[PDB]
Amino acid sequence: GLIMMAYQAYDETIATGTFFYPVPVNPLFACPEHLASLRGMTNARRVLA
């Protein structure tokens, strides 16, 4: 797979639905900013927990 630091998603050069996907995984890193995955639903997972 891969690892990655911080990039650009509000968004104007790169895709979705071909070659990437979340993971939060193997514990000693702290990543606040992958806010951008998988749509059609509520408001649930960024301002409830």
């Binding site: 104007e12 050069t13 790169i14 895709a15 639905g17 071909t18």
Partner: protein, 94 residues
């Protein structure tokens, strides 16, 4: 083109307006005559922009079709990428 016949401003004027690099607006006027005015202003720019987009016409022997820049499907996507441009090169054909 004919007949409207040519923008003298006046308030006729005519929508295209198929000139370029016009040293005509200033130029003399001199000044605008006794009419109402309001658009005028709109009918001016709406044609001026076209008279530069059409004024390109050529320079397309030097371009370069545009691309998606951005993109979306792209009816295949399923065996072949879809991404586009940011336009930081130069198009010039020499």
């Amino acid at each position: 083109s004919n007949p409207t016949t040519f923008s003298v401003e006046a308030i006729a004027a005519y929508t295209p307006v198929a000139l370029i690099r016009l040293l005509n607006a200033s130029g003399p006027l001199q000044p605008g005559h006794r009419v109402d005015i309001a658009d005028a202003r709109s009918i001016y720019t709406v044609g001026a922009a076209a008279s530069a987009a059409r004024a390109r016409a050529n320079h397309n022997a030097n371009t370069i079709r545009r691309t998606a820049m951005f993109a979306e499907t792209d009816p295949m996507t399923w065996l072949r990428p879809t991404v586009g441009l940011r336009r930081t090169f130069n198009p010039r054909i020499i």
